[PDB]
RNA sequence: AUGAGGCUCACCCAUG
RNA sequence: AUGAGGCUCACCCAUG
RNA sequence: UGAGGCUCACCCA
RNA sequence: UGAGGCUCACCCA
């Protein structure tokens, strides 16, 4: 058993799919990275800690890079023109059962489901209106 | 046109579906709340601001309550035994096109897709392993 | 292979069996918990360390809870009336072969076998006499 | 009901079985040892005390010898190279009933049952993976 | 794509082959060891980390036992007289692509190929001359 | 004999093969470089030292460059965009015979053999999972 | 000596 | 390191 | 704690 | 900035 495995971060059908694979798990911080130049890679990190007596707290991070080539003095390197940073923290009381978590997850999936307000706004450089 | 509308936060097929509807949009902070007692309601807030010169930054929040009845002196009130707090911040450079955002969104949808590491861990009071 | 799998902690003839599963491997400490709220779960943790230049030390910890339903602030919460803690440390020389280690496991199995002195005293709230 | 009697520590199905028998009872600390020189014997000690006002605590200790290349009766130094030490401490709240204690024994039996992670990792000089 | 599997460390054409298999994964440091007491086993550990902002670094460690006059299972001291230690550190800039990395692996394969200086000097207790 | 000879560092089916040759033995450090400008050359260095009273230590270093053509001061110069560094130290007891040393070489050859875990992770920019 | 310490890589650091 | 030291249990204490 | 900031497991009030 | 905390658009280093 193990969930620290390779998975599809971006789904482009079956071709162009961005896959992220395990890379390091030091200090309680699991890290996934896509293939090729670390400089142009997608990155996902996750960790859980007992934030307070009654709370456990997940801290997840995602990085989406803008793949580009940097030329300098005629020396071209694979870099990331820029990066987009996702950064969430989920807090769950110790009284939550597996059923309660399953709900908390369905909530997060719904929040971003296609067509709903928030993901629709983000995908259009827009806000709410 | 408008995206500040009612939407399904939790999808339980077609029955038990948690729907959240607009409630207030003051100070650039859009807010959605489920029906019935505000005390046991789901809550979603979202806002966008120009964080720096080159960055725009979304700040999204979700609250999942544990619906319960509080009895005191024989007076029972609808309350929330506890609450789970989602709290994300997404940063996107001003050079991102609509195509780049569409990707950033597909990344977030994949992160939480059923069966993948992170949502699977959360739904089981577990961490990575 | 991979030995980080779920297993039956308390065997009750396939009915009322407390089965524990992998839940976290952060910081080199493997963890298993039962399908309960993290506040009423059985918990087993294991970890191996090269304690000395010529030794290895396994540290195993097991928590058995007495589940209950406390009514705090006039609200019902799943909780543990009390917990029983098992803490064991096994130190094995590096010179011990596999057939030497198999011998240690067998000793620990026979120690707690039904009907033998120790598990007999424990289960009857008495000492050895 | 005297439960201080000899028992089988290592069971090899009749042939090659290791029997441990009463050898000392000084200070309420019962001791069982095999029929060997004390430097190569299997030893088991066990005692109970009221650790604190809320708990009771069993302290069980097992010493198992390294047999591969052992020289029966001979002098083998350094001693730490030829012995593995087990060290258990079971804490049980004063509210635990006989039935509660039986469950705590079952939990310990299951922990070490054949084919489960822990006893499998140990018997192979491995950790969890 | 799980690449953490058993493999052949010492190949003697089928007969007398030394297989090393997964034995630990604590702290993201994967460990492989042969079927021996830990004092005489072949051991392999490997990990990756972002050494600096510009680099990534693999730290591979191999422990190989002295076999001539070895006493299988026995206690052999001093330990430093019966073990050879390998210690590799591969630094790879973040700009290196998969293809670049393949070439770096080929470079390492060639370094140690049969009949080349280095592996020839080592296998004969010699230096370069 | 004399083992200080040239050899193939990177094998590309006799075409595009990076062959390295002896270039310096000053200060007890044998050196090999490729037929390039000293600024874009592959470099391999080896040296043996009687580190301890009972040990010998081989220190091997390999540099793999990413050749490029920088335009400094408006002039074209052959240079290295970046370098990848391999640094290995092998410590072998003086008691190790030739057949013991041959065993070490074979272990290091199998470690990097195509298809095995480590060279597989390295060539795909990932860790072991 | 030891470090899953660091480098622009036969150098630097920490510890002991 | 060692403790038939302690806990609300991957923490605290004592000694050395 | 923050609709505090970042070159993102860092920094700030 | 933080794998800083919360009763969650607040507070902290």
Swiss-Prot record, chains A, B, C, D, E, F:
Entry keyword annotation includes Disulfide bond: no
A single Gene Ontology CC term: T=3 icosahedral viral capsid
Compartments reported by the entry: Virion
InterPro entries, alphabetized: Levivir_coat (IPR002703), Phage_RNA-type_capsid (IPR015954)
Region (Viral RNA-binding): 31-104
Single GO molecular function: structural molecule activity
Key word RNA-binding present: yes
Record keywords: Capsid protein, RNA-binding, T=3 icosahedral capsid protein, Translation regulation, Virion
Pfam families on file: Levi_coat
Gene3D superfamilies for the chain: MS2 Viral Coat Protein
One Gene Ontology biological process: regulation of translation
Alphabetical list of SUPFAM superfamilies matching this protein: RNA bacteriophage capsid protein (SSF55405)
Subunit structure: Homodimer. The capsid proteins form dimers that assemble by group of 5. Twelve such pentamers are linked together with free dimers. The homodimers binds to the viral RNA via an operator hairpin, but also to many other RNA sequences in the viral genome; this interaction probably shifts the virus from the replicative to the assembly phase and ensures specific encapsidation of the viral genome.
Family: Belongs to the Leviviricetes capsid protein family.
Role summary: Capsid protein self-assembles to form an icosahedral capsid with a T=3 symmetry, about 26 nm in diameter, and consisting of 89 capsid proteins dimers (178 capsid proteins). Involved in viral genome encapsidation through the interaction between a capsid protein dimer and the multiple packaging signals present in the RNA genome. The capsid also contains 1 copy of the A2 maturation protein. Acts as a translational repressor of viral replicase synthesis late in infection. This latter function is the result of capsid protein interaction with an RNA hairpin which contains the replicase ribosome-binding site.
Protein name per UniProt: Capsid protein
